[PDB]
Amino acid sequence: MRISIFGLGYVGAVCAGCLSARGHEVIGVDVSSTKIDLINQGKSPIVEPGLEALLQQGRQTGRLSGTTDFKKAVLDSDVSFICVGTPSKKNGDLDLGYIETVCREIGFAIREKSERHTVVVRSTVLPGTVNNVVIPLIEDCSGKKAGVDFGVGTNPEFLRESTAIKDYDFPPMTVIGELDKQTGDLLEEIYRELDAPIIRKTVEVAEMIKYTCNVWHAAKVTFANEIGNIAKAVGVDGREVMDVICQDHKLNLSRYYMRPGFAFGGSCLPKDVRALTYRASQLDVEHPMLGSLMRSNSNQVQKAFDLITSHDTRKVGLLGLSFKAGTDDLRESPLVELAEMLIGKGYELRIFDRNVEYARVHGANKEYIESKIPHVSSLLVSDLDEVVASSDVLVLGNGDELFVDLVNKTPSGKKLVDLVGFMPHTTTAQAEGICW
Amino acid sequence: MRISIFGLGYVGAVCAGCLSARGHEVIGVDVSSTKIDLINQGKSPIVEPGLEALLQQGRQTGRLSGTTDFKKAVLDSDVSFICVGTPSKKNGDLDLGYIETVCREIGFAIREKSERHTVVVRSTVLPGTVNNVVIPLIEDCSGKKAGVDFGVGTNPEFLRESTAIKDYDFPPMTVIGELDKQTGDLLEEIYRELDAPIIRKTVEVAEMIKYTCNVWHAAKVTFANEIGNIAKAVGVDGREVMDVICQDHKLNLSRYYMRPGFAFGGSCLPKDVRALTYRASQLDVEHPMLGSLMRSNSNQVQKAFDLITSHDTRKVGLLGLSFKAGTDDLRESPLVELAEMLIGKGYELRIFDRNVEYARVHGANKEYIESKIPHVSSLLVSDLDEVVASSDVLVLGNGDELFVDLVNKTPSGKKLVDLVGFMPHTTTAQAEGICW
Numbered sequence A, B: 001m002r003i004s005i006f007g008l009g010y011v012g013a014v015c016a017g018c019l020s021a022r023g024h025e026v027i028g029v030d031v032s033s034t035k036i037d038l039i040n041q042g043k044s045p046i047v048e049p050g051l052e053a054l055l056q057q058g059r060q061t062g063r064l065s066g067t068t069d070f071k072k073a074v075l076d077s078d079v080s081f082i083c084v085g086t087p088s089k090k091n092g093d094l095d096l097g098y099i100e101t102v103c104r105e106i107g108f109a110i111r112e113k114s115e116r117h118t119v120v121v122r123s124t125v126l127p128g129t130v131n132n133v134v135i136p137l138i139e140d141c142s143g144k145k146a147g148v149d150f151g152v153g154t155n156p157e158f159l160r161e162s163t164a165i166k167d168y169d170f171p172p173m174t175v176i177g178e179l180d181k182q183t184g185d186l187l188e189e190i191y192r193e194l195d196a197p198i199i200r201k202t203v204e205v206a207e208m209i210k211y212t213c214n215v216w217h218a219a220k221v222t223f224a225n226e227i228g229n230i231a232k233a234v235g236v237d238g239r240e241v242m243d244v245i246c247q248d249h250k251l252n253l254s255r256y257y258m259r260p261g262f263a264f265g266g267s268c269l270p271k272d273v274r275a276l277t278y279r280a281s282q283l284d285v286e287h288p289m290l291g292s293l294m295r296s297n298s299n300q301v302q303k304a305f306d307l308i309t310s311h312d313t314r315k316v317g318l319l320g321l322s323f324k325a326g327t328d329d330l331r332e333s334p335l336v337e338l339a340e341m342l343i344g345k346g347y348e349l350r351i352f353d354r355n356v357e358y359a360r361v362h363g364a365n366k367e368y369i370e371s372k373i374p375h376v377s378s379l380l381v382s383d384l385d386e387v388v389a390s391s392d393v394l395v396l397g398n399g400d401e402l403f404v405d406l407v408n409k410t411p412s413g414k415k416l417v418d419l420v421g422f423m424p425h426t427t428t429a430q431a432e433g434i435c436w
């Protein structure tokens, strides 16, 4: 394939060498004469193991070249990858400056070109960028329409500097953001050989996936460092602790706990976050991320409240009260806190929870249910169909399978508020998700 | 084996059932006759799948019994598991009330016992608790000493409510905080048959692991929730986003990024955290956890600085300057930030970095190095031995394998500050770790 690459930095130079190696005709394009000079001499502009050899091979085979002539590069390629920088502005927002000039440059170049050109954004940009910045600019400068007259997609990079070539050859996955099907198919063909999944999504979803990956990496480092600081302070090797945490692939290094949804609760998570942060504090160990968990958690409870009370009706049916489905435990249940907020604000609440109902009459926590929270437990209704029929707003609070049927066959005149993830798709006028 | 379990709540009742199902003769002890009466009837005090059947089996084989008579329980068992509650005090700290009580009971009961008895704490308690609270109480109440007379250890649990039996039967791992080898060996025998590693560590490390696991679980939930909230606000399904993140077992769901150490840097992680958080703010999306990362990160740079400037000497040698070993990239390097802090406070700094030195001669970054960061680059020394010879404090800043030798064979008169994890062991008078 004939490929142009705009930006020969840490990402673009790697893509040029990697694509060159795979048999494609590659034209690297940059504003820096110096970067263009080094590439044409087959030299690495950066220290990245293996890159020079690949640039070398690319020149020797005549498949790799560089230039500042963007118009010619476009003219002589079928697809252009945008790999220019997107640094922070002073305020932390992303600076689209470089993206915009390349978009203008590309737009003007396809204006005179009759063959269908394709533009793929590899540069990391915030959700909405392609739809609100890239496309309007390219369309405006070219006088042609996105998708129809030129292909447009995104293809976020997951390469780490110092292992960039291995990461390219052996990625966790390939992500493609697509508008027109043809560009998606084009990208699929380019990466077909790699031993990894090809994931095709909308452009906005692809952009959000990339950011989430990077912020997750940052969060992991921060977590380890804070745990580490606390360990040292109590006289233990933080590396030793983290080493055993990393041996658990059932809970720790798995997808469990990673579904967006509602606040956590129960008698262990909140209590242990509070104790560990309290100990850190006593030991003068700063811990901003760990110290923010309870606040974020309580914010999630408020968010649910905000959704539920936005419907101009006081009739609410809460499906689930225990902190998780399958248990009767009410200790620090967010659904109990939600219930109390609603009662406090005058809502006509009915609650369904088969486990708590059962425990109310058979078990060891009857006192707590009948005497400590009668204001909540007195609102229990044995029949699910009655909570549903008499309520205007139905909130799926925990994961009881009993609630599936309600979600897929919802009676008329109800508003669903999904805190768990039962809904097959995204928010509609009838049903809204806490994170979808 | 004969075993007594103290506290028949969500944890102990499961342990009682699971232990008896494995042939052990179990005596459950609780202060609540209500729980005790129900267990003797082969009935579960909570709703937990399969517990009743396990409890009835224990009753029908004569292996499971319940009582308020703790003296008899101790006399008639080889080991006592402490599974009592450890709830929050009003200020967030750990409430040790129930633990203390059980410790005095056992101690008294033990004063009599002829055979050596073994006490194992399953309850989640902070590091320092067994040595500063449990042992003193028992020892003082028994008239005996820990280790020689009675066994003592910890054995945290990782069971989840609603799937407690399955979790018990197939745990991620077994963790033992051992003091005397006899206790440890005893626990090993109990858990030998489980298909998962048995990890024996000190009591402090053991407890730190338990707290870390739970706080990690909370952090995962919180991350997914915050990302979910942002996703919803930008118009996408947060679960679809998180679903793809979870398809990456190389970087996302792996141990990568989980070593305690130094701040993160480079031209992507900081920039992307800042951009995402900026956008979230614009969209009125609160994000306390994501919003604390950059502050935690800058705190970690300060911590390293604090370690370094604590030795009453101005001769600092910084080993590593790029944000990562293996690359010359200096963008948002925390090592550069550290250097600038040391320079500003007047230290006499020498810096070694092979990759940055090379880039100063070959590559497209000669400018930033020679004209944007002269005050730092002019401190570069090409010879590692000279940096070591001339410096009093040596900072291991990134993971260059060239630094291994210095750590294993450290010349006399040097203080090491390890920011990455080269040290084989924990902090000493001559070498200190940022998290060990």
Ligand SMILES: Nc1nc2c(ncn2[C@@H]2O[C@H](COP(=O)(O)OP(=O)(O)O[C@H]3O[C@H](C(=O)O)[C@@H](O)[C@H](O)[C@@H]3O)[C@@H](O)[C@H]2O)c(=O)[nH]1
Pocket (backbone or CB within 6 Å): A251, A256, A257, A258, A259, A260, A261, A262, A263, A264, A265, A266, A267, A268, A269, A323, A324, B124, B157, B158, B159, B160, B161, B213, B214, B217, B221, B224, B225
């Ligand atoms: N939003 C969201 N919430 C979740 C998810 N998964 C779990 N939760 C919630 O996290 C909370 C705790 O659930 P879980 O960890 O399954 O149960 P539990 O509290 O019983 O077990 C934890 O504490 C035990 C303990 O200390 O005793 C641990 O042993 C155990 O491993 C758990 O960490 C609950 O409120 C859940 O709803 C998720 O993917 N998304």
Ligand SMILES: Nc1nc2c(ncn2[C@@H]2O[C@H](COP(=O)(O)OP(=O)(O)O[C@H]3O[C@H](C(=O)O)[C@@H](O)[C@H](O)[C@@H]3O)[C@@H](O)[C@H]2O)c(=O)[nH]1
Pocket (backbone or CB within 6 Å): A124, A157, A158, A159, A160, A161, A213, A214, A217, A221, A224, A225, B251, B256, B257, B258, B259, B260, B261, B262, B263, B264, B265, B266, B267, B268, B269, B323, B324
């Ligand atoms: N304390 C600690 N720090 C770590 C650890 N692992 C990495 N770091 C640091 O994390 C930072 C980032 O390193 P890394 O992710 O290896 O490199 P890079 O920044 O080049 O790649 C990341 O951004 C790319 C990108 O957006 O281009 C991503 O593609 C890529 O996947 C990474 O997420 C560096 O400062 C590291 O030193 C750890 O286990 N512990």
